Write a protein that binds this DNA or RNA. Structure first.
Lengths: 141, 63, 100, 145, 95, 206, 143, 56, 63, 111
RNA sequence: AAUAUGAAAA
RNA sequence: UAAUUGCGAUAACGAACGAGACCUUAACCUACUAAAUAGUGGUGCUAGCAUUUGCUGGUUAUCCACUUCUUAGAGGGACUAUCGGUUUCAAGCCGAUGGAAGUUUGAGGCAAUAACAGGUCUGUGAUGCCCUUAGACGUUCUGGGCCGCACGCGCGCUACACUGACGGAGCCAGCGAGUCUAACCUUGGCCGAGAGGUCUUGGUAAUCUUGUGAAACUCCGUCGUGCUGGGGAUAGAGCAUUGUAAUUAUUGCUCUUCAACGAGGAAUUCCUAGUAAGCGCAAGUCAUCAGCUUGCGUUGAUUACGUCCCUGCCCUUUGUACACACC
């Protein structure tokens, strides 16, 4: 079997699975290339991990991502975390700790949510208001 | 208009009827050791830099 | 002869031991199994006001019926299936088997 | 979508079926200013007349507009569907009409006066000037009077 | 006390019903406006739909069309486009 | 530099202007630093941030927002108003348009001119609504740099937004000229006129 | 390397294919294309008053390709939008069944898609090949 | 036949009606509760009561 | 506030009063020690009791 | 009422409950109603152990002046629990150390 | 700093 | 200390309810147990481009492997952990470090003594007392009414526009619900502009509705600073649905009508992060009908990190001519 790792990314309800394997440097999300992503503005955000490392480190990794759930921004963040951690697992499992550690240090020094999932969860709505904390208008007369 | 810079060395609790302002013992960068006490609107830390419009007004309290 | 045996209960503990003993009994009879596959929990909830008359402050209250579903797949000859479907009966665990 | 000077043929304002029509706005809304033709009807007849939709009404020539008016008076002849018109059935003629400007006001008054004289509840409500389609008048529409 | 008289409540009926310059941009070009644009857009270090509307009195829509034609004739250089705002320069070789 | 090529082609400028240096979409952070020794530690400039969208948690601590790049703070105070809440996609689009326009209008770094805008419209005194017997009386007090930054960003955004409302001018460009006016000290800026009016009243009511 | 619909951007792919249908003319555009709105949930008929049907066909051709198979119900849902219920709040209302049906039926005539098991329509073999062809054409006119 | 949601709330409703019946008819026999057996082809209602011989 | 409550302190002090030689200064060993030597009824309470035990062990080492 | 409900609490306590409380609410002495509680032992109300242990029942009794309601709460002894936790979540029963005599001479025991 | 009054029995 | 939370002091000692402890839910698990009612990869068969070696798909009786994602059962984990400051030098707090998480880790459930002359006898076959009981105040049938409109008040839903309106694209969620001997959730096909009609289909449900392909959002075009394509109230004509029956229009749709509304006076509501707010979705009632609430998810701010100044709370001291208790 071709060497591979299987990393997940999540943000709010959005999830993304990142199959990482040795290949020709092929980057796809949901069967479509990374350079095709929408929204156009978040395109640079998803480039952030590979842009920082230098794309030479993906020359020999084939990464394919499937994404489901969340929305059009949660999906982007899940993708970025997914390929971020996909690179880590490949470099941990089949390369060396030196590459893993320098990579991990570079990733975090830019932005912690590359590897660590955002802990914020949607607080349950409570009776007596539209939202989790807001309440209906108090009228006294 | 003239200006003067200074640095907070001690923060001495809040003040103001509603706790609006903060007591800060301030120290000027120029002419060191000329320590002063000032009222500040908004949140500050220690080792913070403030531009004063004037230097020598003081307040032990505020309403 | 393949059968799927499934469990439904509002209480977790009784159903869990039924699944465990059913699985273990079939295994000691060397019966092929697909493990205790656990379904998503069906959390019924009723949202209603506490006060009966409806006067007083607007307060709301939810009741929960958690519903657990398990099932296990067996290919088993009938003469031992006689014992398999009657070996374990427990309170509150609605159990039923289907042929194929 | 080209840069072109309008010659002296351009006029700043035109007259259409007893109503004045702005010139430099688009033709479709130029038509909609008329009583009895909204955005939907005006867009349809503009397309049916096949005039340049993108152009402003100020620089279109008479031949297109006289045809346009003819479409309004006789939409049934130009394959406009029955369901598209505002008088899809008449309460005196089995024919299907479409009324414009003074005609629609006069026809509106006839319908209200027909209801009143037969003493229908809706006509009676219209006579007294109240809500007719069932609104809760308790808190609604105090200031229209 | 709280209950008013019927005559006083009749003041509900006595309430009565009493209660508490456009700009004239072009929208159509002429020879003079046409002359004006190609003589002045060599200036206007920043050109956009709103700037053309403000400082040439064009009716906005025709400002958009003119921008496309100014682009086609190459006197303008892009920095960004969008379906709601575009940013343009004088095709300056200075920057 | 080298044009590394992958099985998925990645465009040349994305390698060039972004891998060789962690710039903004176009502009750099280097040699850009506030002219104020007070706000050196509160503007967050001189830190590689890249795109102006980040899901960081800046509300857990009082001064954790002091680590936010001011561009994201600009985006935040831009969308706050009414119907525009949420919609940070529109916000980032608008600020990107604004930085484009700024560098069209001038040669200095757009992230430099916004920094001068903040350090120019940050009020240095403000009078509190402190109570008193019978009638309230003002009191002029000095202002925290964090309050200065917050007030300055707030004043820039409303000066942009109030001009954008109900007219032809678009939000991005009105924000840009407000920013250039603030950096160069123009009184036509809404923020600068509001800032020195606040200082004027404080000077009277010291 | 290879070409697939998923490789080119949606926007350029769809307008290229709509122009192709408009230019090819093999598509049986119904007569009522000029009288109709895309759904009772919209409020104006399309602004590309003639090429909109070709746009719809191109979009539905792309979507059937990207999916296993779809039907009119999914098509109405997908192209529906937020209707102003007058004063009352916006309600999501699906597209118009007849128009999204005749696009499929005209699309069937050209043979790009075929009625498929599990109901609905699946992208055909020959339709897929020419869809990859125009996909190739889009990614070559980019440069 | 009936769904699992409906089947088990029907069991709850069935148990409640039985419990009400027994608390209305067995109060003098010191009734104290019910557990309902559900077995294949057989079901039995076990009552707890101080006066077992009186309910006999 | 993290102020441990009366029951935590009673159980914590009781453990040390008769298990000083067997206890350690490491939270993990004392936690997994506590699990079997006392019949605490919940994991959350067990960790709280374990944490304060080590806190007091550090105190005893102090004096 | 007084003698009757005291008989109930006495019965329940000798029957082995850890605590009980019986309240009679209604007209009683006069027209205006009041509520009498005859608790003894000790009862918990708040924590989840209320479901585990506190048995509760309410019954209406009808006589010539009107209705009276009887609420009975019985905190059964958790140590007697045939199922569920043997004790309350704050119950911490330390096991006593077996006293060990200190050894001074190292030694080895052969097989 | 200004801040008056609150029906009869129960 | 969030806490009658503790440390301590001590004519009190020892205790009990409350808080806490607890329970559920929300965050981590490359671990155990697994999974044709969840998947993934590989291999078969097949489609397209490459023509190719690679890429993207369709196909469960093609099979095999696996549990990363998904469901779970049992369990681990967090205990302010460790470090540095700080205080009877104790409880504790502050900063930093690591960590999925260091505000009781987040939100709820439960929630004490005493009481109100709070709300309900229009939920109750729970009832006391009074009335009535056959030209009944019972039950039921037909039609109105609960909506009636000179006005005042309270929840809200729309907007007053370029951070948009419109059209054409991209187009991604979650909570949840659904029929069988009775008729639900409905797929697919066909017909109709539309609502809707029609023939079948799966589903007693992680299996089908449903990836509920939601909206807001983004991208490309019409616009134009204008009571304008903003708003669509208000009325007319017509077309269907639910219903025995719509009329005092149930509701949907088509065309037409296009009024107020220019950021809202004194006043006042809510809110400290996935929180406000925008944006819809599911359930509830339901034969049809939502502008309503209960939940859910998308996008996702600003400003705090304090105070007792307004409204209030808890404790101690104090004064009292108050005790149906500052009304």
């Amino acid at each position: 079997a071709v060497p591979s790792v299987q990393t997940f990314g999540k943000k709010k309800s959005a999830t993304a699975v990142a199959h990482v394997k040795a290949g020709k440097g092929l980057i796809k999300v949901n069967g479509s290339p990374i350079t095709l992503v929408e929204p156009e503005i978040l395109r640079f955000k998803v480039y952030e991990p590979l842009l920082l490392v230098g794309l030479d480190k993906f020359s020999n990794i084939d990464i394919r991502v499937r994404v489901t759930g969340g929305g059009h921004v949660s999906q982007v963040y899940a993708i970025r975390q997914a390929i971020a951690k996909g690179l880590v697992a490949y470099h941990q499992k089949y390369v060396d700790e030196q590459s893993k550690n320098e990579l991990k240090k570079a990733f975090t020094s830019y932005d912690r949510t590359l590897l660590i999932a955002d802990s914020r969860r949607p607080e349950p709505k409570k009776f007596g208001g539209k939202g989790a904390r807001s309440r209906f208008q108090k009228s006294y007369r | 208009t003239p200006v003067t810079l200074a640095k907070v060395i001690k923060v001495l609790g809040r003040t103001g009827s509603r706790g609006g302002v903060t007591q800060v013992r301030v120290e000027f960068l120029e002419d060191t050791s000329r320590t002063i006490v000032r009222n500040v609107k908004g949140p500050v830390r220690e080792n913070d830099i403030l531009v004063l419009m004037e230097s020598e007004r003081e307040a032990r309290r505020l309403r | 002869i393949k059968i799927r045996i499934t469990l439904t209960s509002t209480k977790v503990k009784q159903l869990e031991n039924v699944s465990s003993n059913i699985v273990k009994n079939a295994e000691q009879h060397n019966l092929v199994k697909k493990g205790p596959v656990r379904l998503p929990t069906k959390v019924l909830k009723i949202s209603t006001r506490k006060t009966p008359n409806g006067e007083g402050s607007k307060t709301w209250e939810t009741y929960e019926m958690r519903i657990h579903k398990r099932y296990i797949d067996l290919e088993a000859p009938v003469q031992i299936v006689k014992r398999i479907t009657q070996i374990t009966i427990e309170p509150g665990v609605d159990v039923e088997v289907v042929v194929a | 979508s080209l840069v072109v000077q309008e010659q002296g043929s351009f006029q700043h304002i035109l007259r259409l079926l007893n109503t004045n029509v702005d010139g430099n706005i688009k033709i479709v809304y130029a038509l909609t200013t008329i009583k009895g033709v909204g955005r939907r009807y005006s867009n349809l007849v503009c397309k049916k007349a096949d005039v340049d939709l993108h152009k402003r009404a100020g620089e279109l020539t008479q031949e297109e507009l006289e045809r346009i008016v003819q479409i309004m008076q006789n939409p049934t002849h130009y394959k406009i569907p029955a369901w598209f018109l505002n008088r899809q059935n008449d309460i005196t003629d089995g024919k299907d009409y479409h009324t414009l400007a003074n005609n629609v006001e006069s026809k509106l008054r006839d319908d209200l006066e027909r209801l009143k004289k037969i003493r229908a509840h809706r006509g009676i409500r219209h006579f007294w000037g109240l809500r007719v389609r069932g609104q809760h008048t308790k808190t609604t529409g105090r200031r229209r009077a | 006390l709280s209950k008013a008289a019927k005559a006083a409540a009749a003041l509900a009926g006595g309430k009565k019903s009493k209660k508490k310059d456009r700009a004239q941009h072009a929208v159509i070009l002429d020879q003079e406006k046409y002359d004006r644009i190609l003589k002045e857009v060599p200036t206007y270090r920043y050109v956009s739909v709103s700037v053309l509307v403000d400082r040439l009195k064009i009716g906005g829509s025709l400002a958009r069309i003119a921008l496309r034609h100014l682009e086609k004739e190459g006197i303008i250089k892009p920095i960004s486009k969008h379906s709601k705002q575009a940013i343009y320069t004088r095709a300056t070789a200075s920057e | 530099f080298t044009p590394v090529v992958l099985a998925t082609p990645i465009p040349e400028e994305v390698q060039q202007a972004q891998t060789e240096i962690k710039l903004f979409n176009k502009w750099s952070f280097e040699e850009v630093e506030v002219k104020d020794a007070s706000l050196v530690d509160y503007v967050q400039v001189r830190q590689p941030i890249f795109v102006a969208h980040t899901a960081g948690r800046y509300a857990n601590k009082r001064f954790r927002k002091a680590q936010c790049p001011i561009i994201e703070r600009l985006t935040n105070s831009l969308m706050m108003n009414g119907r525009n809440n949420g919609k940070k996609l529109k916000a980032v689009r608008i600020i990107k348009h604004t930085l484009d326009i700024i560098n069209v209008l001038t040669d200095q770094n757009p992230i430099q001119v916004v920094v001068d805008a903040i350090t120019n419209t940050g009020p240095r005194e403000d009078t509190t609504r402190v109570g008193g017997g019978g009638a309230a009386r003002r009191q002029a007090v000095d202002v925290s740099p964090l309050r200065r930054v917050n007030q300055a960003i707030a004043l820039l955004t409303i000066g942009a937004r109030e001009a954008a409302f109900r007219n032809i001018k678009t939000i991005a460009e009105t924000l840009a000229e407000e920013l250039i006016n603030a950096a160069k000290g123009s009184s036509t800026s809404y923020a600068i006129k509001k800032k020195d009016e606040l200082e004027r009243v404080a000077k009277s009511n010291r | 390397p290879g070409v697939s619909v998923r490789d080119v951007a949606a926007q350029d792919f769809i307008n290229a294919y709509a122009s192709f249908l408009q230019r090819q003319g093999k598509l049986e555009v119904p007569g009522y294309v000029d009288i109709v709105k895309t759904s009772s949930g919209n409020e104006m008929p399309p602004q590309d008053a003639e090429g909109w049907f070709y746009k719809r066909a191109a979009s539905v051709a792309r979507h059937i390709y990207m999916r296993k198979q779809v039907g009119v119900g999914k098509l109405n849902k997908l192209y529906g939008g937020a209707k102003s219920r007058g004063v009352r709040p916006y309600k999501h209302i699906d597209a118009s069944g007849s128009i999204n049906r005749k696009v499929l039926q005209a699309l069937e005539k050209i043979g790009i898609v075929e009625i498929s098991p599990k109901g609905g329509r699946r992208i055909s073999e020959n339709g897929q090949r020419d869809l990859d062809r125009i996909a190739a054409q889009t990614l070559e006119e980019d440069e | 036949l009936i769904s699992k949601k409906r089947k088990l709330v029907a069991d709850g409703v069935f148990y409640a009606e039985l419990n009400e019946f027994f608390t209305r008819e067995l109060a003098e026999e010191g009734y104290s509760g019910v557990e309902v057996r559900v077995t294949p082809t057989k079901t039995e209602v076990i009552i707890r009561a101080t006066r077992t011989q009186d309910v006999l | 506030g993290r102020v441990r409550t009366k029951t935590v302190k009673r159980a914590s002090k009781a453990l040390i009063e008769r298990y000083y030689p067997k206890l350690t200064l490491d939270f993990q060993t004392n936690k997994r020690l506590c699990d079997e030597i006392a019949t605490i009824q919940s994991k959350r309470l067990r960790n709280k009791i374990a944490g304060y035990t080590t806190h007091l062990m550090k105190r005893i080492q102090k004096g | 009422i007084r003698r009757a409900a005291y008989g109930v609490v006495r019965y329940v306590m000798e029957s082995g409950a850890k605590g009980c409380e019986v309240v009679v609410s209604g007209k009683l002495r006069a027209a205006r109603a009041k509520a009498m509680k005859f608790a003894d032992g000790f009862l918990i109300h708040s924590g989840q152990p209320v479901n585990d242990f506190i048995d509760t029942a309410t019954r209406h009794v009808l006589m010539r002046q009107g209705v009276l309601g009887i609420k009975v709460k019985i905190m059964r002894d958790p140590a007697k629990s045939r199922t569920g936790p043997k004790a309350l979540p704050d119950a911490v029963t330390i096991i006593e150390p077996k006293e060990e005599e200190p050894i001074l001479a190292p030694s080895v025991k052969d097989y």
